[PDB]
């Protein structure tokens, strides 16, 4: 991993010893790519909803696992389910849930440092991991992309800026998510946006999290090319705000 410092270098500390799991996946593998072309191709908004109970910068929230999931598979197009335990307060007790008892798309959203962490969300079946340039060396990158496709996933790479876009259509990306959160303080800064989605190829999906709250960002969004749009926060407070996103 990169030297990082505060509670990035902790978490990822943190993350290299995390442990894995005896399991069995279950139901196949299903693209969660693949799922966001056919809602555009069907002129249905694209959501991916986040569940998470806590955050970093003060998200606090009371919700059960499979009641948000029962409830965004009519809705959503996907689903990302934080895993990552000291300061999202997640867990692969969390990703088990929500796969026995929804048939959409899930991605599984930590910090991954590791193989084993692949290995454990395709056995606790998640069809999909995140994989965070900022964290990674460009090799790091590469081999866990890699391995990942081993398995059957395409993986979200995940950006910040116009290096971390520059490494990822190095590597071969297929699927991006194209962050506004300062990675080290979090923290939506949207200036640079415009100029960094304009940069990514046409071939690319490309997915938006950025705290969208209001569905006019949205439709400008789709002006600028974007697939479709991750959101956490406004839909774990009140999981019925996504009828206004469609």
Known sequence: PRYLKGWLEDVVQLSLRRPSL?????????????????????????????YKRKSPSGLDVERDPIEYAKFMERYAVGLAILTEEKYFNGSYED??????SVSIPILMWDFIVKESQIDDAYNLGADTVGLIVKILTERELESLLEYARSYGMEPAIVINDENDLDIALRIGARFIIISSHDLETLEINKE???????????????????????????????????????????????????KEFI
């Not at 709250?213 to 407070?237: C, D, P, Q, T």
Request: without cysteine; hydrophobic residues 40%; aromatic residues 4%.
């Open 192 to 242: 640079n946006q415009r100029k960094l989605i304009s940069m990514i190829p046409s071939n690319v999906v490309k997915v938006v999290a950025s705290g969208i709250s209001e569905r006019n960002e949205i439709e400008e969004l789709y002006k600028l090319g974007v697939n479709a749009f991750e959101i956490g926060s406004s839909l774990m407070r009140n999981p019925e705000k996504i």
């Open 95 to 100: 990703l088990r849930k929500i796969a026995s």
């Open 22 to 50: 005896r399991a069995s996946r279950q139901r196949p593998i299903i693209s969660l790519k693949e799922r966001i072309l056919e809602f555009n191709k069907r002129n249905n908004t694209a959501i991916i909803a986040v």
